[PDB]
Amino acid sequence: SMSVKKPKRDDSKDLALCSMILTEMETHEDAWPFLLPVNLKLVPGYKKVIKKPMDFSTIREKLSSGQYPNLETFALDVRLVFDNCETFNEDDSDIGRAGHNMRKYFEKKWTDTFK
Template identity: 45%
Template sequence: KNKRYKEDDDDDEDEDDNDDEDEDEDNNNSEEDNNENSYDKTQDLLYPYPKYDFDEYINQISNLTDSISITEVKFYKILKELYDDERSKEFWVAVDLKLNPKYKKIISQPMDLGKITNWIRSVHYYSNDHNAFAKDVRLVWENCMTFNYDS
């Protein structure tokens, strides 16, 4: 769960402990939501995909001249294009195995775009390994086609 969902869980636990504290927290949370968060929580629940700031990632490494950084910038630009495409939302998180219990039986190597992004950020793709990156991105689409073949 991300932090927003954890806070929602904490609010539920507080109700059981003390109603007065809960009212204060609800008032504080409402003020915080109005001030800090301009996003629509309903949209977040309908499409709970991670938030990435690819422009920031690119800016952080674009001044570096080593080949790994240059490759990372290319990877991030490709992922940013995909991220900005509304049709890709479902591919940024792992398939929910509770909603799709047969998925693990059909798909031997699950992959999602969020996992790829996190791997790049943790230097999983070394050097100029364009092939590993391309293979994993293709795997996202191949898994989708394989799992939904009968649909």
């Protein structure tokens, strides 16, 4: 509360560390469904159904331009990518499986880097 603060957790490396994680997500072999925004002209249903599209290139630009106020807003967008994927794709599809694999990969890197 006012003039009462928990000890200051060092957040000075978060930007660099989120960038490293994002690099590792970008270079994963199953990243291909997530590298670029879904083409809303070419994919029926996407625009109406997925209220907040998100992809790794969009996260990378937001990261690089100071549009994440803290590491939690970064994780929210990464998770959004996978939550969108599960909303639109069957579990038993290449993309559906890719999304599960990437979410697992992300969550481990997140826990190991920060928790």
